[PDB]
Structures are given as C-alpha cells and as structure tokens.
A paper describes a structure:
The GSR is a gene expression program that enables bacteria to cope with a range of adverse conditions such as oxidative stress, heat shock, and UV exposure. Stress activates an HWE/HisKA2 HK, phosphorylating the PhyR and promoting sequestration of NepR away from σEcfG, allowing transcription of stress-responsive genes to occur. Exploring downstream effects of RT-HK, we identified two homologs of PhyR in the genome, RT-PhyR and RT-PhyR′. In the structures of both RT-PhyR and RT-PhyR′, we observed a typical arrangement between the SL and REC domains.
Aligning the two PhyR paralog structures shows a reasonably high degree of overall similarity (2.7 Å Cα RMSD), with a notable major shift in the position of the loop connecting the β3 strand (immediately following the phosphoacceptor aspartate) and subsequent α10 helix (α3 in standard REC nomenclature). The propensity for the unphosphorylated PhyR homologs to bind RT-NepR′ may be related to the density for the typically flexible α4 helix seen in the RT-PhyR structure. Alignment of the RT-PhyR SL domain with PhyR structures from other organisms reveals a shift in this region where its α4 helix is situated between the expected NepR-bound and unbound positions. However, we are wary of overinterpreting this particular detail, as intermolecular interactions between RT-PhyR molecules in the crystal involve the α4 helix, so this position may be artificially stabilized. At the short timepoint, we observed transfer only to RT-PhyR, suggesting that it is the cognate partner of RT-HK. Further, the intensity of the phosphorylated RT-PhyR bands were higher in the dark condition at both timepoints, indicating RT-HK’s reversed logic had been transferred downstream. For RT-PhyR, we saw many peaks shift into positions distinct from those seen when the protein was titrated with either substance alone, indicating a synergistic effect.
Author numbering:
A (entry chain A): 10 to 77, 85 to 264
B (entry chain B): 10 to 265
C (entry chain C): 10 to 74, 86 to 265
Amino acid sequence: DLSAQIAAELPYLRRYARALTGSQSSGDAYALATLEAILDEPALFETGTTPRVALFTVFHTIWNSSGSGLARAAQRHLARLTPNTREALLLSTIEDFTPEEVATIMRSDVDEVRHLINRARSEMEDSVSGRVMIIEDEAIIALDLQTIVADMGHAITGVARTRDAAVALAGIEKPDLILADIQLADRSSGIDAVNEILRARGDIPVIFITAFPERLLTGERPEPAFLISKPYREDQVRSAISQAMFFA
Amino acid sequence: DLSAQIAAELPYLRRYARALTGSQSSGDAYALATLEAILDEPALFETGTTPRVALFTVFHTIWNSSGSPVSDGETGLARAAQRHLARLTPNTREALLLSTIEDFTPEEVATIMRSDVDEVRHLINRARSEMEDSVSGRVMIIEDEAIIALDLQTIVADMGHAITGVARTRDAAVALAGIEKPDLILADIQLADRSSGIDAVNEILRARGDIPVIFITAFPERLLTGERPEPAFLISKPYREDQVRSAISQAMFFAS
Amino acid sequence: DLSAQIAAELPYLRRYARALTGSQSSGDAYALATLEAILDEPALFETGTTPRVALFTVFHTIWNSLARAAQRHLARLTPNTREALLLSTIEDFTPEEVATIMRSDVDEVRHLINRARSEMEDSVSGRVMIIEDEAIIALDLQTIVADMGHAITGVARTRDAAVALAGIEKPDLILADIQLADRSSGIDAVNEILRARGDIPVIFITAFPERLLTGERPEPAFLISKPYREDQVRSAISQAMFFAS
Ligand SMILES: [Mg+2]
Ligand SMILES: [Mg+2]
Ligand SMILES: [Mg+2]
Ligand code: NA
Ligand code: NA
Ligand code: NA
Ligand code: NA
C-alpha cells in the first residue's frame, strides 16, 4: 500500500532535512511540508520510482524553493559552500541513495551528481580542525571512531563511557562536537549526558550514533538533529561529522 | 589560500562600505576598489594578520585617503548625510561599525585603522556620545516574528526614538506607513502571510520618497553579492543589541 | 536535418583541435579535414550516437593517422592522455562519451585521465599575467593558477594597464578576457604585448566562445568559456603551458 510505504519513509526524510538544517524543528517542518505537498498535489509523487525516491524528490523541490536561530558563525561557514554539494553528498552517504537515484531526486543527471559529490569532498579538505568528544562505552567502537575523527584532521578531547565521565570530561575541555552513543557502560544514557553537558556548556553540535535511529525520528518529542546508525559505514560518519561541524 | 579567503570576505566588505556611504552603489564600488588595490599591489596585503583583517585594513587606507574609487560610475557619500559631516568626529562611525556590525575586536579595529586599542575605545565612546546629540526620529518595524519585533522595539525605544508601529504583512506595512511617515524602516524579507518585505518597502518608497531602510535577515550574504539591486543597510539575525544600535544610528544620518 | 546538426558542431571541433595543436591554423584545418572525411566516406559517420559525439569520433580517427627543449618535455607525456582530459573537461564530454570518441572503454578513459592529471604534477612553475576586468573573476583565476603551482606576474584590468604590466615582467602565459573595464579589448592588448615582447601563449576567457570559432578570421588557439569549471581552467592552462618558452 502506497500510504503505508510513504509513512515508513518519513523518518528518514526527517533525518535528511534535520542534517541539512542542523535543527529538529526545521528538519521536522520541511519533512511535514513535503507530505502536505503530496497530499495537496498528488501529481507531484512520481509513481515510476520507488516511494522513497519519489518522496525525497518532492522534498528537494520544496528545499529549492525560497521560504522557511542559526548561529551567525554557522551562517558564514555555510554561505561559503557550493550549492547542492552537501545535499548530493548526504543523499549518497547517510541516505544511501545510488548516484542515479540522487540524480532523480535532484532532477539532474548522474554526471552532475558526480561533480557535486567531488566538489563536496574538495571543500571538506579546506575545513578547519576541531575538537571532538566521544561518548561510547564499547571500547572497540570508541577506538574505531577515534581513527575516523583523526584521519579527518580533528582532535579527540577524550572518550567517556558513562554519563558521569562525560559530564566530567566536558568540564575539562569544552568540545566543538560530541559523538554520542545512547546506552552507556553503567546503564546511564548518552541522551541525559548530552542534555547535562549542553545545559552547562552551551550549545554544541551532537551526533547520536545508535542502532534503530527510527526511534529518534518520530517528530513527536525532542529528538537529535544529527543521527548516524549502528552499524555505520565510515563514509556516513565523515559526512555527519563534516555536516555537524558547520554548526560549531 | 589567501585568494580564496579574500573573496569569501568581499560580501562583508560590501556591507561595511555600504553602511558608511549609505548606498549599494558607492559601497560596492568602494569594496571592489579595495580588491583592485590588492591585485594591483599585492604587497598591500598583510600576511601577519587574518585575511579578513588585512582586507579591511587596505579598505580603511583607501577610505581615509584623499583619493576616490575609480569606478564604472560615481562614488561618494550620499548628499543626505553631508550635513552631519561637520558635527561628527572623524573615525568614530568607522570604529563603531567595525567593532559591532562587523564583529572585529578593538585590537583588530586598531590594526585596521593603524591605531592602538585605546584610541579605538575612545573613538567608540565619542560615537556613542554624539549619538545622544542626535534628534529623535520615528521608526517603522516590518517583521512577522513577534518576539523579534518586540525586541527591536525595546532597542529603538531605549535609544530615544519613537516606534510608529509593527507591521507583520505587506498590507499592514503599506497602511502603517500611510498612517504615519517613518524616518527609518527596519524590514524583514519573508512576512507572516508569506508576502515580501522588499515589495512592501518599495511601495512605501514610492509614496513617501527616499527613507533609509535597514533589512534584518539571516544569511545577509545573499543580499551582499553586488550582482543585483540590494539594500544599503543590513543587520543579521541573530543579532546583538549593539549591532542594531549601530545600524539604526548609521541609517538615521541618511534620513531627511 | 543531420547536415545542419553537423554544421552546428564544427566550432567546438575547432576548439578541441586548436587546443591539441596550439595553433588556429592547424586546429581549423583538422576540423575541416574531419568534415571532408565524412563527406568523402559517409561510412565513417556513426548515426547511432549524437552528431557531436560522431563528429569527434571521426576526428580522433584522423588525429591518429616547437623549440627542441619544449618538444623534449612534451615527449615525456603518455599518449592519448591530453586528449581524454580535454575531451572530459573543456569539451564537457562524459566518460562514456569520451570512450566512444576514442573507441576505448570508460575504464581506459579514466586510466588515461588519471595518468594525465598525475603528469601535470611534473610541470614547472611559470609566470602568468591575468588580464580580467572583473576583480572577482581575477581573484578566482589567481586561486587556480597558484594551486597549479604557477606565479601571477600581475593582474591588469585595461588595455593600457596590461601593456604597462607586460613591460615590468614578461609573462610566460597570458589569460585574457575579451571586453575590459575601459571598453578596451583584450585582443588588442594581447596583440600589442606580443608585438613587443614576442610570441607568448594566450588563453582567451569569453562568454560567447562560438563567435571566436568561425575559422573565418584570426582567432584564439585556446579559449575558456564563461562560466567555467575549475577543471576547464586547469586543462586549458596545462595545455597552453606546453607551448610556453
Ligand atoms: Mg553503548
Ligand atoms: Mg519573517
Ligand atoms: Mg569583461
Ligand atoms: Na516524486
Ligand atoms: Na550544498
Ligand atoms: Na539527521
Ligand atoms: Na594560433
């Protein structure tokens, strides 16, 4: 049933729009506007592609149209990016669309998609080095994330395996970015650890890395702006880190 | 990466030059004259300072000099604010705008103006003094986000100006300007009914003549390209109170 | 009508062949030879591909049938590498399009394109005067030239200023826009500079490249089209540098 197929894909649309905007409120609003457009003008929903691709195609139309807070530092960083490059990269990595599917969604051809992705990775080489804190109780995961962070040119403030170790580490050195698992070693939650750090140290971008990200993509309650799945591919971690970094 | 860094900063050099001149025309001409001076004399660029600071340091040398921009048209102040040139202390408006709207620290403003941090602080103190010598005007606020509109009103009132009212739609804005002519307009782009604050401003400008307009918007970079008609005065969202105060005083100099 | 479709692609074949040879006279002759071949031997022309693709395919077939120190370096370049690069960058052909044109596989096209991009790192830094009247464009061209490893002798924005700057430092390569700030022409500036300091390779930057590809009057050997991609400016400056000295 197409109603049920669209409903199943809405969480991922929220994931994508939240990553583009850095915000749950903006991302969830763009995802909702996409569904509204499809209900108001059903002819917008291409039936010759998969519902997932058709849904994201409509979202990219709304995304391109002027319309619908953000730090002025983030606004300056984002303003220097080549248009449509971050969209093509995120669609290709975190959303795992093939290059032809990406060309469909952005109403382009596959060779321009390849250029946009290549331009995305070029501008990622000019980015400044930041400091990243990792909240993760599985030591092999933490070590793997450290390797990815380092090869991106970033520094690690440290690894925290419990909420309390995380609140303590953030007090020693305010990170530029937090990578956060949910269930920690002492059965405390990375969600609480993050909330406590942010109350104390101000807004810092946070990427939650979790199995079943769908449970944080409902739109019904406060939820993260950046979500990577477990298991993860390295390309998805690099895209999320570079994306969240724009929001300092 | 100096070339890339200088080009990234050119939009902000336009913002600054436009505020000082009162016109997109002369401001864009002054910012492009700054870049043309660096390409002509690369040694003009200080590598010992950030590209942003070095760019603005070159701009201030040109601004202060007896010379004028060799541009496609005519460069200059704005005629309206010529009468205030006799009452204002040199380098005070420059120091205030650089340290507020342009977000330079007083040490970076000292470098830019080839001065010391203490002279810059006194220049900023003398700018705020001469702001008390300014007469009260009437400000119209076009803005649909009510909390921002309220906040803007508290700043305007705290500076001693009156507020004609707040309009949240293009239709409310054309009515408001007809009820009471404003000396200055603060305008957002996307209004409550999705109508356009640019369109609203143009309509007011037709009926009442030239009134200084300050556009308040996120991503001001999209109005700082010099590739199309664009505002002379731009405040960012989010803003700091000191930036709103520096933009309201600056634009008031160009009022009737 | 396939005759008109072929005619409309001739200017771009002249661009390609001129850049490969470094000379208007040779590039225009190679482009005409390609049309002549198709008229003489209609079998050469494949109707299953786009008329632009089929025309470049016939030219590559024909393509395969100065200064000793400059020839000594150009001889170290791997065969078919410059062609695959220029076809993919300035000619905006897709990898599969280039593979058809060279009667190769898209696999080999990337092997070639990579080898060419790697052999560009073995290039010598060179002086590059930029005659652009739009400062924003000049800054961006200075970025690509500097990243490639070349110096910038200067940036001029008027005919008289470019002629003056040529007197201070003889460039090895001139990037020249057609219409300058004082309504002067970069063509006249380039001609006056070359008349004085001798022959120097020139890459003309221009919106409207087709009106410089007629073959009916003296025209540039190398042309970058506004707007441009960095890969295009990089393929045009590497190609043109082969003819510097
Ligand atoms: Mg865990
Ligand atoms: Mg608004
Ligand atoms: Mg021009
Ligand atoms: Na669709
Ligand atoms: Na982008
Ligand atoms: Na997300
Ligand atoms: Na020639």
